């Protein structure tokens, strides 16, 4: 369940990065040395995602990868991205903050996963444009 929470936080960070086209929040999250820095990023990334939701540029969907998987579609600057997985719940944020109060390592783990998701999606999108 700890890995599932970290994975859902990584999906939130990856969606926020792909939508904003800025690594700054993921950089801040992966370099955090205090609960203050982690909590500030968790707010700021959700505030970016909230704007994308209100603009209908961020939406939840299902995708067949032959079973349907939960996903998040992100439209940014005319690029379309799809992150596979769920976004964190309020309970996942609260449980993740409790994990950070024990060990800030979990912020680095979530940041590393988020950057991996974003990099794979950006690489695939550039390859399809070149073809």
């Amino acid at each position: 369940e700890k890995e599932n929470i970290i994975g859902r936080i990584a999906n939130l960070l990856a969606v926020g990065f792909l939508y904003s086209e800025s690594p700054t929040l993921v950089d801040r999250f992966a370099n955090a040395l205090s609960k203050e820095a982690v909590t500030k990023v968790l707010y700021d990334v959700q505030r970016i995602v909230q704007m994308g939701i209100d603009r209908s540029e961020i939406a939840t969907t299902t995708i067949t990868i032959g079973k349907d998987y939960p996903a998040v579609n992100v439209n940014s600057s005319g690029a379309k991205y799809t992150v596979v997985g769920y976004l964190p719940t309020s309970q996942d944020i609260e449980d993740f903050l409790r994990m950070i109060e024990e060990d800030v390592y979990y912020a680095r783990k979530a940041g590393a996963l988020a950057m991996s998701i974003a990099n794979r999606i950006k690489l695939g999108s550039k390859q399809s444009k070149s073809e």
Partner: protein
């Protein structure tokens, strides 16, 4: 053997760097073993190299030496402290290589007259007959104090963009802030004294004549580090500083003050100096203090108000 320790307060600084990755300059960081109420932990914290302070001190020494009759080397006249390691410097400055160990002392004296820096700061020459001279000043890293269970140091990246009217310009710089501390040392009993052992050679009289002047210059130099002038990237990242506590001691025997890790570290060093004057037969022990933070001090300690007073007293 003038020893001492110092504490500093800084904010929004970047006074060193390491290999950079991408568009983010990396502030130097190091591991530390910390003690808490539970046990010993490992942490990573920003630090400042020890060689930067040595470079700043040597530069100030050159600046104050050229202001008087003391000599300075050609290469070191420009701020390039290579001294006489490689043969290219020897050829440029015009000094013959050391023939054999019997000639070795000669070489040292010949090298020890042209450049005061090569004397105060020691040097090395590698070859058929290597020659060494250990530095007369010693320094270490500038760590934040490990007081308590929380390290009072913070680090964080920043964002900066270069304007452009024809986009086709973005960079990040790390910034840190911590309560720094460090201890130094300088042994004035060996300045202008040859280290290699052998029969005396001509010119040593001249060395003897200027010993007082060289010692005065070396003592004056320390004001550079005491004031705060050192570190790179000060053109735009100018860090605010404010002295908090200092301890300087003069003796005639080996001695080292207590690292500035406790709210009460002046008292311990004073007591240890008082008790150690006798354990090793000595005939001189003086201490000074510049306190501005209201910590425990004790009694029988000369108290000043500015570093200038300390420098003048030490010169006296």
């Amino acid at each position: 053997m003038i020893s001492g320790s110092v504490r500093f307060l800084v904010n929004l600084e970047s006074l060193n760097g390491v290999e950079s990755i991408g568009n983010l300059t990396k502030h130097r960081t190091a591991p530390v073993v910390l003690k808490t109420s539970t046990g010993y932990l490992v942490r990573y914290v920003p630090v400042i190299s020890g060689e930067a302070l040595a470079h700043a001190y040597q530069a100030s020494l050159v600046d104050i030496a050229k202001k008087e009759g003391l000599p300075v080397g050609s290469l070191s006249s420009q701020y390039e402290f290579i001294k006489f390691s490689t043969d290219e410097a020897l050829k440029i400055e015009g000094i013959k290589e050391p023939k054999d160990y019997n000639d070795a002392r000669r070489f040292e004296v010949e090298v020890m007259l042209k450049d005061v820096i090569a004397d105060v700061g020691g040097f090395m020459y590698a070859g058929g007959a290597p020659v060494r001279r250990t530095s007369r000043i010693k320094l270490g890293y500038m760590i934040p104090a490990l007081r308590g269970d929380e390290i009072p140091a913070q680090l964080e990246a920043q964002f900066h963009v270069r304007f452009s009217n024809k986009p086709v310009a973005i960079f990040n710089v790390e910034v840190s802030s911590a309560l720094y501390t460090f201890s130094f040392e300088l042994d004035e009993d060996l300045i202008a004294v040859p280290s290699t052992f052998g029969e005396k050679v001509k010119g040593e009289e001249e060395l003897e004549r200027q010993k007082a002047k060289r010692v005065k210059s070396a003592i004056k130099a320390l004001y550079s580090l005491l004031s705060g002038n050192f570190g790179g990237k000060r053109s735009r990242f100018l860090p605010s500083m404010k002295l908090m506590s200092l301890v300087v001691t003069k003796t005639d025997f080996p001695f080292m003050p207590e690292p500035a890790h406790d709210d009460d570290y002046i008292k311990t060093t004073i007591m240890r100096l008082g008790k150690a004057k006798g354990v090793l037969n000595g005939n001189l022990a003086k201490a000074y203090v510049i306190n501005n933070e209201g910590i425990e001090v004790g009694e029988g300690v000369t108290v000043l108000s500015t570093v200038e007073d300390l420098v003048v007293k030490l010169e006296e």
